[PDB]
Symmetry: C2
Subunit: 357 residues, 2 copies
């Protein structure tokens, strides 16, 4: 019913696409009597310019108080001469850690008027409607030791380190997700070699008993690789570790041709999450009105669903987006069927129109 959304526009096209999203968001909620509050906070270069830090204290306070957090994008050449800790990106990663977000969702859906842009033949990419869940916290990435020895640096090592809990929490959220979707989950691992994988597969099996309605299937990372190309239509929800997830996520991006309008979510154990578009800030297109708001809008859609259970409301936005693209409208970047180019503002106005239909 009531919801306090933390809004963090950011840099570049960030604000543009955010306004577009908020508009769509507002209408949808209005149509069902929902009351929402939007507190705007700074992050990235903006925050740096106004508070010296890419992630000011006020912003954290707002986020902690909020039911969820909507983000645009951060980045720009103005801050590229600063040390890593004093750059846009840092504020983003910081915010993610402070909120304790471990799950990262990267949905990938096939849009009919976009199949011509798909690197694959229509027959395959057609029907693709999956979501990849990635472990953000642990993995081969943060695992120590990572060093050289020898002497003379003759030997080097990296460590894949996971705690039973880190694996439990993610596989749990994965199940809960597949449960509100087509109830099909694919635990991808390398259980044939990695011990961490063996632990993962065990826990997958265990958690399964708790969600008997969800079909658990086990796949080895390398097979999934081929399958994302020759049969991505089979996947509903895919759960996987950090390193493997990173890879698969990127692979799945290109398959539909919808890259550029891809949303994402970084969830945790409860109904809180940070939703933002995959695309960057693209400071070059700043102000010119070519900023593509579709990604951010679809993000707001994910928010409503995953953080508020507002399915009906979420589907509205998803349909609008689909229909408008079905009509051939885009801001210029997407290669929609029969090119009908409009501006950031218009494409938005269109989405709203379709909503009050």
């Amino acid at each position: 019913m009531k919801m306090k959304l933390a809004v963090l526009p950011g840099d570049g096209i960030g604000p543009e696409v955010m306004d577009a999203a908020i508009r769509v968001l507002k209408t949808v909620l209005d149509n069902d009597g929902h009351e929402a509050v939007f507190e705007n906070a700074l992050i990235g270069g903006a925050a740096i310019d106004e508070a010296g830090t890419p992630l000011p204290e006020e912003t954290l306070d707002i986020c902690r108080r909020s039911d969820a957090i909507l983000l645009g994008a951060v980045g720009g050449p103005k801050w590229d001469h600063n040390p890593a800790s004093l750059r846009p990106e840092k504020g983003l990663l910081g915010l993610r850690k402070e909120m304790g977000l471990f799950a990262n969702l990267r949905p990938v859906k096939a849009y009919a008027t976009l199949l011509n842009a798909s690197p694959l033949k229509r027959e395959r990419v057609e029907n693709v409607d999956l979501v990849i869940v990635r472990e953000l916290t642990g993995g081969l990435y943060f695992g120590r030791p990572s060093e050289r020895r020898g002497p003379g640096e003759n030997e080097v090592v990296d460590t894949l380190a996971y705690t039973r809990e880190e694996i439990e929490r993610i596989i749990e959220k994965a199940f809960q997700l597949a449960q509100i979707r087509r109830k099909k989950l694919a635990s991808v691992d390398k259980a044939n070699v990695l011990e961490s994988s063996r632990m993962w597969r065990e826990i997958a099996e265990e958690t399964a008993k708790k969600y008997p309605d969800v079909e658990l299937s086990h796949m080895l990372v390398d097979s999934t690789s081929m399958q994302l190309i020759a049969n991505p239509g089979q996947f509903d929800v895919i759960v996987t570790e950090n390193m493997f997830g990173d890879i698969l996520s990127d692979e799945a991006s290109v398959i539909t041709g919808s890259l550029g309008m891809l949303p994402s979510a970084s969830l945790r154990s409860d109904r809180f999450g940070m939703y933002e578009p995959v695309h960057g800030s693209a400071p070059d297109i700043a102000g010119q009105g070519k900023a593509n708001p579709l990604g951010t809008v679809l993000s707001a859609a994910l928010m409503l669903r995953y953080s508020f259970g507002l399915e009906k409301e979420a589907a509205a936005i998803e349909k609008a987006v689909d229909d408008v693209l079905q009509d051939g409208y885009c801001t210029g970047d997407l290669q929609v069927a029969n090119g009908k180019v409009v501006s950031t503002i218009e494409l938005t106005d269109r989405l709203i129109e379709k909503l009050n239909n």
Copy 2:
């Protein structure tokens, strides 16, 4: 010239496909006085029966005295239910370990007749012609600690370990291969996070100096992932560590729609090498004259190219293969343009028939 070759047909359709390779090989070699000395041996399940072990010491001696080793495939229902030590696969692993083969070279190229079947839109997959060189010896696959640490074993770890030499050799090999190809090497890693990758790139950069005529590029595994889909034609020779190469290899397998006629090869620091088709044993198919010999036949050509340097000879084989596929011929597994299914012996006959 003369060339002693170990022939390990293996089991299943192994001996069927291995035949074709031998026939074709002879047809080609007898073009300019080439003494092809073949010496058959046992391995995998076959060996298990007539020797008790998946890898008979006799086979090793055979191998150790051969210029290169051709192989069919190993595996079967019969031996799959016995202990791990008496499983046919270990014979292969062992032999590879005994010969010290570290680099796994697995080529992927487009074949016009199969273009309709590719998962990628014609324009993308067309013209593809790359080779992925994967490191086999080290990495996260062979590295301890790899256990569940307490309390209550509620912690687990795996180790990615590499030695300066394991890396140096794989990269030098890669460079050398690029030099005989289009002179373009793509070193793939995760050098922004993995210290092993950081070291890998360093070494890759240093080796580049010794091969100034080869264009080196560094790509992150993940980018390389989407590139194999979006623009696979940009690659020539890709090189990377175990884990990464295992994945990428599999990814690139389907892109051209030729998985089933794809050959592989395991090499080491010298001209010696082991060549085998990527396909399994396929027991249920055994004897029915429907096994695809192309995969093994291509492996034979790779052998002539990488072990003996007989480029013109390898070229002829690959041409012959294309032409047969050009005429819409296969055994049923492939989906050629105007498809015509014939038997294994038949295709082979055509291959030879085209081979002259």
